[PDB]
Structures are given as C-alpha cells and as structure tokens.
Amino acid sequence: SDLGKKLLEAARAGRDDEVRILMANGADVNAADVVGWTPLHLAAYWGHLEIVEVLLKNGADVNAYDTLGSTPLHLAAHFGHLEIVEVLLKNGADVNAKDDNGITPLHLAANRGHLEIVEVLLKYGADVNAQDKFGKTAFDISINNGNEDLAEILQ
Amino acid sequence: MPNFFIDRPIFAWVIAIIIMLAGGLAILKLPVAQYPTIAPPAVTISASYPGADAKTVQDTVTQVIEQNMNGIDNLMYMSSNSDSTGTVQITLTFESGTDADIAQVQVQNKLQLAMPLLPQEVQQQGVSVEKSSSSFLMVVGVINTDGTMTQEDISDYVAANMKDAISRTSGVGDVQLFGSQYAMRIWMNPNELNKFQLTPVDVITAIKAQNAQVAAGQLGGTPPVKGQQLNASIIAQTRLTSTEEFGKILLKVNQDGSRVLLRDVAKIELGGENYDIIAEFNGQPASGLGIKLATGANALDTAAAIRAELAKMEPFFPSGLKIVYPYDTTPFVKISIHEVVKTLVEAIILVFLVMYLFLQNFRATLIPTIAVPVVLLGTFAVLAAFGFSINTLTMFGMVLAIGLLVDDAIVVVENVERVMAEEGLPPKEATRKSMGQIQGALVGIAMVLSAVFVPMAFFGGSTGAIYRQFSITIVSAMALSVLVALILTPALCATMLKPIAKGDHGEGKKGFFGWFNRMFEKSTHHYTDSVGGILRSTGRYLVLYLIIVVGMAYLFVRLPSCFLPDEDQGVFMTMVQLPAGATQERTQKVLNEVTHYYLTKEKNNVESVFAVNGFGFAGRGQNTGIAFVSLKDWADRPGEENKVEAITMRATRAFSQIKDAMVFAFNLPAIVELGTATGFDFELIDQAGLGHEKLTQARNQLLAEAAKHPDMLTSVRPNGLEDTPQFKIDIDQEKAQALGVSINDINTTLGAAWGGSYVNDFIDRGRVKKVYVMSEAKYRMLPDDIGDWYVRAADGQMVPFSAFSSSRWEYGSPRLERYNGLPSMEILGQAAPGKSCGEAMELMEQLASKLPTGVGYDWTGMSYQERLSGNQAPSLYAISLIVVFLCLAALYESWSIPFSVMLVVPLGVIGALLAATFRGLTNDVYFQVGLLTTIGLSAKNAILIVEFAKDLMDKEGKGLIEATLDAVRMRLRPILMTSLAFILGVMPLVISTGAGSGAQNAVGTGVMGGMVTATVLAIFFVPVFFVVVRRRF
Amino acid sequence: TDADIAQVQVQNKLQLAMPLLPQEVQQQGVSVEKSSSSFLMVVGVINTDGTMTQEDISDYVAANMKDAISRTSGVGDVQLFGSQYAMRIWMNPNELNKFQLTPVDVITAIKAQNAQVAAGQLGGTPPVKGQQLNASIIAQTRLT
Amino acid sequence: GIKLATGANALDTAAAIRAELAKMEPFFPSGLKIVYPYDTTPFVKISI
Amino acid sequence: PGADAKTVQDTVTQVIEQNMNGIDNLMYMSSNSDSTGTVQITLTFESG
Amino acid sequence: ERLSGNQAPSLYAISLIVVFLCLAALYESWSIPFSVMLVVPLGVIGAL
Ligand SMILES: CCCCCCCCCCCCO[C@@H]1O[C@H](CO)[C@@H](O[C@H]2O[C@H](CO)[C@@H](O)[C@H](O)[C@H]2O)[C@H](O)[C@H]1O
Ligand SMILES: CCCCCCCCCCCCO[C@@H]1O[C@H](CO)[C@@H](O[C@H]2O[C@H](CO)[C@@H](O)[C@H](O)[C@H]2O)[C@H](O)[C@H]1O
Ligand SMILES: CCCCCCCCCCCCO[C@@H]1O[C@H](CO)[C@@H](O[C@H]2O[C@H](CO)[C@@H](O)[C@H](O)[C@H]2O)[C@H](O)[C@H]1O
Ligand SMILES: CCCCCCCCCCCCCC
Ligand SMILES: CCCCCCCCCCCC
Ligand SMILES: CCCCCCCCCCCC
Ligand SMILES: CCCCCCCCCC
Ligand SMILES: CCCCCCCCCC
Ligand SMILES: CCCCCCCCCC
C-alpha cells in the first residue's frame, strides 16, 4: 500500500497533521511492515499519544501482534508510556497478551521498573502470576532486579 | 639598466639564453597533474569487526581508538562513523600545510598503542591507517564477458596477477583493489552439526589445530655433540592449501569407528572475504583497480605506463576477461595542456599580425616573438624553484599572464618606433631616450602588480591553495616580463629596428597600409578632439563614473558565487536508496532498472554503467547502491542536450517514477578531492551524555525549524541513516547454567553461524588468504532458524537456542556518528537563492541556540574553512590598496596623483561583470583572477598616460590640458595594439565547448568583457581623472 | 633534534618490547609523549554550589574535558588530578567463601555477562534468493 | 595538569586551551566552574 | 619463529613488498627470507 | 658506476656552454669566446 507505507512513516515520525490527512484519505490503519508492526505499534513504541488515539478512532486493531507475538501494549508498557498504556487499555487491549516467549506487558513494565504502568496494568486485570517461558513472574523480575518498591506492589 | 644592456646586446642575449635553458630544463622535470594538492591532509583509520552491529563497533572499537588520539600535532578535527556492516572509519583532518607523512605516522603510532585495548577479533583483522584522497588518477575495470567468472573470481585473478605489477609501474602512488582475493569458505549446516553432536566451536578448534604452521627445531643444532656430521631444519605441520584438504579436516571419530569430516557438516569453497558488494559493469561481473598518482609524477606518462603494462598482461588472461577504463582524469590534463600551448602560439601569431599592421616592419614583430617565450620559459623555471607543478591552475595562470607579457613587449617597441618617427633619432639613441621615458614606470608597475597579485597568495585553507597557484604564476611571469623589458627588449630594439625619418608616419605609402596609416592618423585627431571636448565638461563625466561604480556594485552582488565551475567530466553518479530493511536482491532490481535506462534511453551518450550494490557515501548496507556512469567522448556528444547537466536532469526526472526507492543523478564536484563545496556542513553534538534517541529528537527539532525558513535555508537534511528494526535476542543466564551450556559456546555458535568468523590463514597457490566459517545462507535468514542451532552442554546433550533465549523487535541505529569524540549527527544544507552562505550559517546558529540543554553544534569541512578563511579577505584587499597607492606615490613624487591611476579600477570590472551576467556565469576563481589581470593591465595603461602627461608638465613646462592631450595621443596606439591582440587571443576561450570548457569560458569571458570596457572607457576617462585630480590638488 | 622523529624512533623500539611486557601493563595502555616534564598550567575545576564531590568533579573532567584538551595542538601531556569513574566491584571474602567462590569466579562471570557480542544479521549476505528481511541481531551489550 | 609539547609556543597553546574550555563551559552541570590556580604564561605575556 | 624460507617469503616478505610502492626517491629494494624465519627488506633511496 | 658514466656527456656539454656564455657576457663578444674555447682539446689530449 502506497498510503499504508506513508502512514507507517508518519506514525513513527509523530507527524500529527500528516496522519490526519492520511486518515481522511483512507490510508490502511492495518498496514504492516516486514516485522509485523502496524502504525499503532510504531506510535506506541515512539510514544506518540495523539496518533495512538486517532488510529484507534479509525479502527486500528488494538491487539495487532508482530512476527514475534508482541502487541502495542507490550511496547507502550516496556518504554514507559503511561498515557498510551491507559488509552490502549481503555480501547480493549489484551492486558495479558503473551508474546512468543510468554512475556506480558506486566513482565516488561516490571523489568524496566515502571511503577505507575504496573499499577495501571494491575488495575485492568493483569495476571500477577503469569509466567514467561522460563517460569518467571513480574515478582521474580522485581526480586532479581532488586526493585524493592516494585516488589512490595506485587506483594 | 636599459642603457647598460643597449650597449651590451650580447650580455643581454646571454641572460636570455640562461633563462631559456633553465626554463627548458624545468619543463622536462616538472610534475604534471590535474590539480595541485588542495584539500587539507586527512588520515583515515579503518577497522572491521565481522558480524558486529554499529553499537558494538562503536563501544568496543571507535570509542577506544578516539580516546587514544592525543598528542598528535596540528589536528583540526576528528570525525567517525560506526556501522552495522561491522566497519569503523575515523578521519583526522590536519591544518593546511601539515606534513601528511608525519600526520600519518603520529596517528598510526597512537593507534598501535591502543591495539591491546581492542577486541581480539579486531586485532586479528587489523586496523588500517591511510591518507584520505578521493583523488584517483584513474579506475581500471576488469570484467568477464563470457559468463565463466564471478566477481570473486575476477577479484582474485586481479589480486594475484595484475595488482602488484600495476603497483610497481612508474608513477603509481597507490592501488586499491575493488573487491577481495579468495577466502576459504566453510559454510556450516546446523542439521548435520547436531546429528554428530558438534557446534561451530568444534569446527573452529579443528581448523586451528589442523590448518597451522608448527615450529619444530633442528637435527644437529648448536650446541652439538662434537663429531656430529649433519645439521638440518626439522619441518613439521604446514598450512593447508586447498578445499580438498579443508574437507578432510577430522572433526570426530564416532564410537563405531566411523569418521566425521568437515565436509560432512559443511560446504567448502573458495569464495569472497565479503559478500556485501555486488559490482556489475554493463550487467557483467566486475572488479577493478583504483590508481593514485605518486608525488612528483607525470600524470600522462603514468597513465601511458599503466596502459602499456596492462597490454603486456592481456595475452595471459583467462577467456572472457576484459580491461575497461570507466574513469580517467588524464584526458583533461592532456586537453588542458594542448589548449594552453595552442593559446600561447596563437597569441604570438596575433601579436605578430597586430605589430605588422601598425608598425609595418618585420624586424619590429620579431622583438615580442623572442621576448614572450623567454619570459614564459623563465616562469617555468621559477615554478620549478618553488616546487609547483604544471597543472590546470598554473596553466591558466600563464594564459591570464599573456596579456601582461605581450603588453610589456609592445610598449617598449612601439615607444621606440614613435620616438624615431617624431624626432628622427637613430635606433640606438631613440631607444635610450624611449627607455628614459618608461623605465621608472615599468618599475613602479612591477610594484603595483605585485601588490595586486601577491595578497591572494596569503589566503588560507583550500581556497588559499587554489589562489596561490594563480598568484605565484602570474607574479613570477610579470616580474620576469619587466626584467626582460629592462634588459633584452631595449637591446633588441637598438640593434634590430630600422631608422625612421622625422615626420614619416607612413601616410605616403601605397595600397592598404597607406590607407590604414591615413585612417589611423585621422582617427587619432578625432580621438584627441573628443578628449578636448570631454575636458571642457568634466562634471558630466564624473556623474557617468558614479553610475558605472553603482552599476558595478549592483551587478557584483547579484552575480552568483561558486568557487570552481562545474564541468562535464565525462562521468557522473546515480544514487540508489531503498527503504529501511530492504535486501540486496531488491536494490539489485533497482540498479538493473537504472542501468537499463542508461543503456537504452541514453545509448548515444553513455559508454558504461558501473553499478555497485551495497555502497553509498552517507552509509552502506543492503538497501543502498550507486551507479557510476561513464560517457562517450565529448566529441561524440554534440550540443547542450548531450552534456552532463541535461543528462542528469533527464535521468533524475525519469527516476522519480521509480517506486519504493529514492533514485537520482548528480554531477561530480569540480575538485573531487575536496568534495561538495556548495552548501554548509553542520554537526549537531551531544555535549552531556544525552544519548542517541535524545540527539535524534533534537535533530528533528532543528530540521523542523529549518524547514520553516525556506527563504534562508534550502535542502536541510541529515547525512546519515535512520534507525531501523533489529532483532534483540536475550540469553537467559540462569537456564544456560542449569543446562550446563557455556556462554562462550552460545555466543560463538550464534556469531560464527550468523555473523561469520575469521579463523586463520591458509596458502592458496603461494598467496596467504583467509579462512571463514559461517552458516550456509538458508540456515541464517529468518527468526525461526535461530532454533535450529544447537549447543553442546557439559553433559554431552545438544540444546537448541530456543531453550535458553528469548527475542523481540526493537529499533536501533545502523550508523552511529561522532565528531571530536562526542556523539554527533551531520546535517547538510545550503543558503536559499540570493542569500549568502554566511547568513544561512548565522541562522542555523540561532536555531541551534534554542535546542534542548546539552545539545551543542559545530561547523566542519567547507563551513569550517569559510569561518576561519573568510575573515581575511578584507585585510588583504586593504593592504593591496595601500601598497598600490604608496608605489604610485613614489613613482610620481605625489600623494594626490596616484588617485588618477587608481580610479581606473571600475572601468574594467564593469565589463567583466556585464559579460559574466549576460552569459550567466559565476563569480568563480577564474573570473576573479581574470578581473585582477584586467585591473592590472588597465592600471598599466593609466600609469603610462599619467607618467607621460606629468613628464610633459614638469620637463617641457606644458599646461595641464596640453600635456594630457599629448599624453593620450602618444598612448592611444600601444593601448589599441595590446587590447586588440589580447581580446582576439582570448576569443577561443570564450566560444570553447567540450572538454574543460567550463574553465576556459570562465577565464576568457570576464577578460574579454573587462578588456573591452577597460579599453573603450579608459582612453576617455583617465584624462578626466588626471585633470580633475590635478585641479583638486 | 626534531622531536617528531625522536618520538617515532623511540616508539619503533618500544613496539619490539611491547609483546614482552605483562598483559596487565599492555592493557593499561603505554604512552609515548614529547613534552616538558613540568606543568605549563593547571586548570582547576570546582563546584561553587557544593552539589558535586571531588570524585564527581574528577569524573566530569575525565569524561567531558580531558580528551579534547589532550588533542589540542601543543599539549604534550595531560595529568588528571583525580580519577575517572570505574565500575567498582568491592569483594567480600566472607561471602565469597560462604558460596565456595573466589575472585577468579567473579572475574570470569563479569567477562561473560558484561560482554558486547557480534551476533550477525538475519538475511545477511550472501542471502538466499527471495529474502525480504535484513536486520542486525543484537545480543549481549555492555552493562551500564 | 598540562605539559607543553616539545618546541610548541606556550602562549599559543594556552590560548588554544582556553578556546577549547570555552566550548565546554555552556554544557556544565550547575555550579561547576573553571578556576585558574597556576599558569606560567601570564608572566611571559605581561613581562613582554 | 620456526618457519622455513619459503613460508616466510609467502606469508611475510611478499605481503610487505607489495605495499612498498610509490615511496619517494626509492632507487631499489632488495630482500631475503631465510630458514631461521627472518626477513630483511632493504629500501635504498636517492642520495640527498 | 652506470649512473656516473651515463651523465658525463651532459655535464661536459653544459660546462662548456656556461664557460662560453660567461666569456661572451664578460667580453661582449661571440668571437673572442670562440677563440678561447677552441683551446679545450689541447688540454684534454694531455689529460688523456
Ligand atoms: C576602440 C576604442 C574607441 C571606440 C569608439 C567609442 C565611441 C564613443 C566615443 C565617445 C566620446 C565622447 O564624445 C565627445 O563628447 C563631448 C561631450 O562632453 C563632446 O563635446 C561637445 O559637447 C560638449 C557639450 O555638449 C561641449 O562641452 C564641447 O565643447 C563640445 O565640443 C565631443 O565633441 C565629443 O566628441
Ligand atoms: C588597485 C587595487 C585592486 C584590488 C582589487 C580587489 C577587488 C577585485 C578582486 C576580485 C575579488 C572578487 O571576489 C571577492 O572576494 C572573495 C575572494 O576572497 C570572493 O569569494 C569568497 O571570498 C572569501 C574568501 O575566503 C569567502 O569568505 C567568501 O564567502 C567567498 O565569497 C567574494 O565573493 C568576493 O567578495
Ligand atoms: C610588494 C608586495 C605586495 C604586498 C603583499 C602583502 C601581502 C600581505 C601579507 C600578510 C597577510 C595578512 O594575514 C593576516 O590575515 C588576518 C586575517 O584574519 C589579519 O587579521 C585581520 O582579520 C581579523 C579577523 O577579522 C581581525 O581581528 C584583525 O584585526 C585583522 O587585522 C592579520 O592581521 C593579517 O596579518
Ligand atoms: C636558443 C638560443 C638562441 C640564441 C640566439 C642568439 C642570437 C645572436 C644574435 C647576436 C646579435 C648581436 C648584435 C651585435
Ligand atoms: C628615473 C625616474 C625616477 C622614477 C623611479 C621609479 C621608482 C618607482 C617605484 C618605487 C617603489 C619602491
Ligand atoms: C591615502 C592618503 C591620501 C592623502 C591625500 C593628500 C593630498 C595632498 C596633495 C598636496 C599637493 C600640493
Ligand atoms: C640611466 C640611469 C638608470 C637608473 C637605474 C635603472 C633602474 C632599474 C633597476 C631595477
Ligand atoms: C639561474 C638559473 C639556474 C637553474 C638551475 C636549475 C636547477 C635544477 C636542479 C636539478
Ligand atoms: C607544457 C609541457 C607538457 C609536456 C608533457 C607532454 C607529454 C605527452 C605524453 C603523452
């Protein structure tokens, strides 16, 4: 897609006004690059909140997953983008989505010590006992990393 | 001194001969080259870390080297890039004038001490230090036309049978192989490895063990048992030499006694060191040699010698192998030289004709015909003394000089002839008297013109290197011309010129000459009448002078200023950039389309396309390439539509239709050695450990702000690569330890298979070459393949990568840049139409001041030069003006009269600007040096008018107007003579088309326009100047 | 004597000795300088708000100032009056013995787990026909 | 502590050192200040 | 160390010699490679 | 040896020419210098 590509580039770049015009012209919100990232993936990774919102209004798949099973929520949680985490969840993001390694948004937020994001994930039903492929929980991560504050949150 | 030599013609001849011998010898020994060295010295450190990403390269190599680059003299700046092909280049640039050999050795010696701090794999590949020079003399292409040889095959053949002999050819300074010699390629199969419970680690160990050179000792070595009869070296294991031997390397013997050989787990072949470049010449596999010219060498002779050596090689070539020559700079050198010699000869012919037309005797025509070559030969000797070469710039210097050499010869001869006609003196007495009238002025002039041309030599940086070529050539020529005019030409005048009876101005001759003489005597009367009328009404001419000065100023500021003109160099480039993550295969598709366009749509103009997949200048990688396009000879490309400008425009237009790729054509810069000289070259700098992402955001902030000022800034863009998706794989340490799998085995297995590993060397038909192990392609393409690789645990079990790893996509940089030791991003751009580079720079600085805390900036390359080099021009012009004034004051014994000469400057400049503007040329170096020549010549005419007028006033007691009128009458003829000779002499330059005509036109146009107005205006205005100035004081 | 030549000659002889020196000496970096023995100047750096300790200041200077001064022409040598930061592992022999470990185990672990691995590429050259994807493989990076 | 390279001009080197330090100052953390406790060059300049 | 003359020529001497071109004022270059593993390459330059 | 012998003709030639030219300059003559330079073989024979 000509306009799908342009949209991928614009979502990544955070070019807000360019995303708008592209939405007006029917640029494919479910365009995917070679690694399976949608515009929503891109905007989530790079922390572009307004663009996330616009894409969701225009019927972006909130639980699109990449070629390794990661979702926009995974990326927003991992890279500390609280508002985007909230927006995604409000729009039905699977709070317990596992990637191909059995890693969840909670695992990722925990690993980077993003306290507020962990609480939001928990508030929306994040499974605190979910294990990755190595049998590890967000709690295990917090302990290994020596994050006392995050350990206390995860009882 | 004239009087000395008038009585000593033989001594004069002796001096002339010595000069000619010196010059002749200098012509024989002088180096020939297109351009002198202009770029400041640069040394580049290059390293390769097989399989490494950019960050790995930076953080284990680049930073380590950079931190050890201290205590090196005359360093201006240091820049580097580290990229995802595993490459680092660090470039150190030194102050102009630095001895490059010392710079190189200092850099190398600091690198040598940093080597122990680098990764083993980098120490094993080694690190290179070279002088940096995109000044190739030529590129020799080598292709196979019968489909029997791959590019790797060709490159090996060239390395083994051609390169070394080219390297030893006379005048060859350096030779780059565009490719690699063969490497022993072990292509591993993970299925087979797992079947026998083996890993790449076992493969590498086996190769190191079984492909080695082992020391032993001697039989009967010292100290011996006395009585020993024999001493002999003991030879033990030596390197393998063939794929067959590598194939039989023994990996393992199974319990049942069967043998596992290397060929049972891998494919074995002679292949390339590297597979990132695919090079094609008109669609066929290609390699080649980039050849640089040795210091001091003759370019033309070297090119000829290179050809002769290749001819000797052709009879031994394998089938289908063919030499091509896709780039050669020596045609320009050849043509440039031929054109200057032709010009010089034409000048002599034209002077002869003009002399004969006016003076109407052959004896007089011979005097300049001797003197000009004497001065020129002398000038060559002076060039040789000061270490200059015969090159484009020095040769144009000599073309520009012609009009001054010619003038000095005309002035002397003409003036004697006039004295003989007016006073009836015999030749020798006339010469003595005549020389009396001019000798002081000739000396004054030498000072004036030294003041005009010398200051230019004292510019700095690259611009100074260019200017200095013109300045030394012209000043030398001019000084020799005055010496010859004080020594040789008076002697020749006194001994060669026939007497003329008092009053005989040839009016009583018959036929054409009779008519001409009567016409010219009458035209002088009309001229002098006119001046008389002008001098009764000097007020309105001072108004016209002001209009000229204002008009000059107007035209000057609006004339675009490039430093050298663009040439059709017979070659240009097309850039190919594909989206992030695009493959070699896709880029090749595009390059094929590009090559197709040129071979079909431009069949009359394009000789060849050399397409290089995997290479660009702003970064390498699978998604980039270049096509070098080499054109048919200028002769077979008549008309503007078949020149590089039109061709690149059509090409670029066409290639905009290409989808999912950025493709466009662009000409080379005039001097390829200093790269693009239009624009600014800005560096954005992380001054506070901000990091890559924060620096990119700040870059975007500045680029976005730059785009809001299109009235000041154009094409403001990064000279780098954008972040791309990358595959992050995390080894789980706990699981590895639990399974008994060592981290070193994991990392070797991953890196050897997916990245390749340089194991050791072997000997292929007597040449040492490398051994690489790597996965066969089909097992290292996709994420799922990771799990097909097994590692052996301590307990002998084979564990798949999937069991102890996890992976995710992320973004990272494929090319990280650094400037003076700090993270950086290079930003290119230019001043908008009608703005100076200065104002653009100023604005860039203001914008940059508003960026986030910790983000600095700096100017590099041509921007750096400009900022240092550009604040000196005013001082130099000021000094020049002052020295001119002072010399004239000495000459005329007056503080006021020098003003009457100096006011002439605008009269030539206006004409040059008119001609340049109308022909749409630039204020370039050639135009500037031509202006200086025009100014000099017009100043010379004015000086002699004023000297004669002042002399008539002081010596003969004549009134102001009477003397001015007699002065201009006497000086009309020599001025029309020199002007007509010179204007015609430069005509060929003006109308020139084809090779080097950019330069020829720039030189010739400004001078022709300048000389018209300098001549036409000065003969009316200089009398005004003298009379006004004298009246005022 | 031309000091540049003196330096080169000294360094050429030194490079024959380099391989014979202990690894630990080679790894600290051996320097060859041509300079006065005494100080042209001392450039001091303080914090006037008392918000940086001596150690902090010294690190700032080592990491953000020293190298550029060192490369400035006419600067023969630069002594830091203080030290750059390093990652300090301060070992406890009681704890080491409790787990049957030694400094040797510590060093091995650090070399293994504070590592910067060249891992190659997906779809790297030479590729299979049809390959759509090319991307760097990122494995272990230096700890921070 | 800065030592002068063999044969180099003390005043020019000091000047170059100052120019380079000037480029660093704008990016200093709060409170960081350059002081000049010991310099042999001012005497040369001033004595001349 | 331990290499025969041919080995040292093919892995050292030839490698060095192939880089020894386009050096100023070089008259001639000679070399030997011997069974003790030693290489000596001598480059002689124009007087002056 | 091969260089020394191959340059001797040039050296004798230029030396003879310079002597002639200096004499010409000195005595303001082409004929007096020719009269003098004819002597050269009378000395050269003795040397040989
Ligand atoms: C190759 C070089 C030569 C190329 C030829 C160029 C042609 C252009 C020539 C222009 C010369 C000016 O021409 C000259 O102008 C002055 C004006 O002040 C005239 O002067 C006349 O008019 C003015 C006022 O009207 C009176 O003060 C003056 O007494 C009277 O004679 C001259 O009679 C005329 O000959
Ligand atoms: C009797 C006295 C005669 C003196 C004559 C002097 C004036 C005529 C000489 C021609 C010069 C014209 O060119 C003038 O100079 C410089 C060359 O340094 C040109 O070109 C360059 O100058 C400096 C050189 O570092 C740069 O900073 C500048 O950015 C660039 O444009 C300018 O565009 C122009 O202003
Ligand atoms: C018969 C001989 C003919 C005469 C030829 C003489 C050539 C002159 C040679 C000296 C060259 C001058 O080179 C040098 O340029 C720099 C340019 O920044 C000048 O410096 C000038 O510019 C700087 C920068 O704006 C000013 O701060 C300074 O006050 C000013 O003088 C130096 O004062 C001058 O000495
Ligand atoms: C290549 C050398 C050319 C020199 C030519 C010398 C010409 C001699 C003419 C002498 C005339 C002197 C008048 C008395
Ligand atoms: C013999 C006539 C006296 C004039 C002398 C000319 C000198 C002019 C140039 C002086 C510059 C130093
Ligand atoms: C650049 C210096 C200009 C000085 C002008 C002085 C003019 C004085 C003339 C005296 C003649 C009697
Ligand atoms: C007749 C007196 C001549 C005066 C000396 C000649 C001046 C030229 C010297 C460069
Ligand atoms: C007066 C001119 C003398 C010319 C001598 C040329 C020197 C060449 C050295 C090889
Ligand atoms: C102006 C002197 C140029 C002499 C070099 C010509 C060489 C031609 C060789 C092909």
Ligand SMILES: CCCCCCCCCC
């Ligand atoms: C950068 C200073 C270079 C000085 C060149 C001097 C030229 C002398 C002119 C005759």
Ligand SMILES: CCCCCCCCCC
């Ligand atoms: C730069 C030197 C200019 C000197 C001019 C002298 C003027 C004298 C007027 C009486």
Ligand SMILES: CCCCCCCC
């Ligand atoms: C090469 C020197 C020539 C001398 C000629 C003398 C003419 C009468």
Ligand SMILES: CCCCCCCC
């Ligand atoms: C003394 C006059 C000698 C001139 C001889 C001329 C030969 C060409």
Ligand SMILES: CCCCCC
């Ligand atoms: C009268 C002076 C003679 C000059 C010699 C070159």
